[PDB]
Short mmCIF file of C-alpha atoms and ligand atoms in Angstrom, two decimals:
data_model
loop_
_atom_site.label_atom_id
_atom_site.label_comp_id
_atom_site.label_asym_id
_atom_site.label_seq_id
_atom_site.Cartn_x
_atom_site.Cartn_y
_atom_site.Cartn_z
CA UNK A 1 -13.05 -1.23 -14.96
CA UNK A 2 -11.26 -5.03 -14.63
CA UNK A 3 -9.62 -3.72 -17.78
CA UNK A 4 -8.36 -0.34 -16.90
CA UNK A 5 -6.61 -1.91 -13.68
CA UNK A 6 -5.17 -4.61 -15.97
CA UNK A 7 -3.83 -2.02 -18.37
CA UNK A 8 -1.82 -0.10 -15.49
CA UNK A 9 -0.56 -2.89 -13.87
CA UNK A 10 0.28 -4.51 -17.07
CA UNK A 11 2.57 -1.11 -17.31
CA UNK A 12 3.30 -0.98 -14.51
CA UNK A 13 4.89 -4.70 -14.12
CA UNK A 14 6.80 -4.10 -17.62
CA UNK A 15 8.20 -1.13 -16.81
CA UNK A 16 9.92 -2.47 -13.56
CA UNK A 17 11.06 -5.62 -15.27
CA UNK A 18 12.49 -3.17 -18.32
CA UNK A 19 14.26 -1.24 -15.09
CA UNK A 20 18.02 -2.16 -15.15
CA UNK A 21 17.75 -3.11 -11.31
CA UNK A 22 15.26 -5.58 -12.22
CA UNK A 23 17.67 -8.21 -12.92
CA UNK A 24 18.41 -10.52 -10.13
CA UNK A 25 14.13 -10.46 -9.85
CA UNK A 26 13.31 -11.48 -13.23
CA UNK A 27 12.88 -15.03 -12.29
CA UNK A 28 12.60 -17.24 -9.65
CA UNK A 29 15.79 -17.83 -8.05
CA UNK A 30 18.05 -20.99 -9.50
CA UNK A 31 19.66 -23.14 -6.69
CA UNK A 32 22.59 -23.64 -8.21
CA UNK A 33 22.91 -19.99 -7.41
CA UNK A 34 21.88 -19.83 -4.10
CA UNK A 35 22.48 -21.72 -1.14
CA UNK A 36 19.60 -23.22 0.84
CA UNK A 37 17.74 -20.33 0.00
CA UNK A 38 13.75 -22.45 -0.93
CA UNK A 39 15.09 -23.99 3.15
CA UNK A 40 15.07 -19.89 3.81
CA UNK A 41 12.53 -18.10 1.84
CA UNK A 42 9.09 -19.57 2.27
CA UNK A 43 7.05 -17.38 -0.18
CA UNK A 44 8.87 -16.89 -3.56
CA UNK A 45 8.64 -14.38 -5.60
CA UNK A 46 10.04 -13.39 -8.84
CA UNK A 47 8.73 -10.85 -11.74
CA UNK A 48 8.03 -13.96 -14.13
CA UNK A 49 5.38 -15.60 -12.02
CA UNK A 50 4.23 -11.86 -11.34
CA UNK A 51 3.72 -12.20 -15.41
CA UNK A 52 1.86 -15.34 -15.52
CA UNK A 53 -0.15 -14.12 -12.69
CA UNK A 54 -1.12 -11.12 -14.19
CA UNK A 55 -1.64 -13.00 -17.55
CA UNK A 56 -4.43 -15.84 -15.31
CA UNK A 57 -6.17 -12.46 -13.70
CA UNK A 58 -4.96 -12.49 -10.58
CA UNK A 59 -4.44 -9.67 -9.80
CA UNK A 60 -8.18 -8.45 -8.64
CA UNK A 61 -6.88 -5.00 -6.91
CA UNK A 62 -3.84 -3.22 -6.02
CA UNK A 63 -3.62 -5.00 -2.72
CA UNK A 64 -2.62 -8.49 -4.58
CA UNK A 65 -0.28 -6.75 -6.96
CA UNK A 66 1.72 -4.76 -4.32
CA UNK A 67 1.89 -7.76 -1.70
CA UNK A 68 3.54 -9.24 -4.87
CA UNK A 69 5.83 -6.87 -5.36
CA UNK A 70 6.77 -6.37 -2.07
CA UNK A 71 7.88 -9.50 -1.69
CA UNK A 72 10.24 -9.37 -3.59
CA UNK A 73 11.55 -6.84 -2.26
CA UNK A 74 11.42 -8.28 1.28
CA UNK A 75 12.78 -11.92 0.65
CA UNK A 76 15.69 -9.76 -0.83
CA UNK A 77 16.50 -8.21 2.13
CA UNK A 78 16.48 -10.85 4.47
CA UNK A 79 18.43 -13.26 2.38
CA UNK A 80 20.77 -10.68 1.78
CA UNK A 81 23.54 -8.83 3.29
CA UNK A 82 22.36 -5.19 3.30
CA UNK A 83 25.60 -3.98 1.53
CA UNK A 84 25.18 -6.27 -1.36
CA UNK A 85 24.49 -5.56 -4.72
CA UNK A 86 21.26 -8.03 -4.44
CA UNK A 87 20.04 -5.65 -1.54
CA UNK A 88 20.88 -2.53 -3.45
CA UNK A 89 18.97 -3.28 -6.33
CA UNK A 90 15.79 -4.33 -4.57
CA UNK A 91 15.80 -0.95 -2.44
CA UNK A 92 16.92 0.92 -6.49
CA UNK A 93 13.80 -0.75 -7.93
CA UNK A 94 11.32 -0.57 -4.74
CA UNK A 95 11.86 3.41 -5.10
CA UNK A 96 10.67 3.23 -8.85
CA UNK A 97 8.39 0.69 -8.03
CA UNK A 98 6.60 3.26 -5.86
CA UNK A 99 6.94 6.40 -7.80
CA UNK A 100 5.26 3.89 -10.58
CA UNK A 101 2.33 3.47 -8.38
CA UNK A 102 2.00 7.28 -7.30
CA UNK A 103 1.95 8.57 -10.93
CA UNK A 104 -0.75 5.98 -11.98
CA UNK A 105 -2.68 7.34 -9.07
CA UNK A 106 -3.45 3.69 -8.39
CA UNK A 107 -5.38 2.80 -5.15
CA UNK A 108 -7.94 0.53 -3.97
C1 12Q B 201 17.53 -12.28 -6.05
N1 12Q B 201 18.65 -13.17 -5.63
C2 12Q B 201 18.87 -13.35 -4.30
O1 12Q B 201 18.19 -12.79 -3.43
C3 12Q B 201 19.92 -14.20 -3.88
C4 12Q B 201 20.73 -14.86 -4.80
C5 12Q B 201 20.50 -14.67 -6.17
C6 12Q B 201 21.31 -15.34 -7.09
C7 12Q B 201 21.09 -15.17 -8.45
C8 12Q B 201 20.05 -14.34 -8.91
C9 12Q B 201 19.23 -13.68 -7.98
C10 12Q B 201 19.44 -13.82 -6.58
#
């Protein structure tokens, strides 16, 4: 029952990362490549930490996981201009990221 969840999120979280619009997410953002954005974003996300935090059992129920994951997605799109290829990526993946979710027929 904690297992089974575990297993599809487990999936779940490797096949996005394996997703070649996972890139710019696969770990937390480098300063060197972007300006003042830790004075911009407040709540970081990135699909390494989303890793480790699967790996410590964090992830309790689908709630955790998709606030996660939407995060991403969201800190994307406001530190981005919609037209770039940062922005297109997150919107590329979020659409996978969902159909994901739907044929796991995860819920809470
Ligand atoms: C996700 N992302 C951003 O949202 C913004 C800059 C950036 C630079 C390198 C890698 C990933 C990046």
């Amino acid at each position: 029952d904690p297992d089974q969840l575990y297993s599809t999120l487990k999936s779940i979280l490797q096949q996005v990362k394996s997703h070649q619009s996972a890139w710019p997410f696969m770990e937390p953002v480098k300063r060197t490549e972007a300006p003042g954005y830790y004075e911009v974003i407040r709540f970081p996300m990135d699909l390494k930490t989303m890793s480790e935090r699967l790996k410590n059992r964090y992830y309790v129920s689908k709630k955790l996981f998709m606030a996660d994951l939407q995060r991403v997605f969201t800190n994307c799109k406001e530190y981005n201009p919609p037209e770039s290829e940062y922005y297109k990526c997150a919107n590329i993946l979020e659409k996978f990221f969902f159909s994901k979710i739907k044929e796991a027929g995860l819920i809470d």
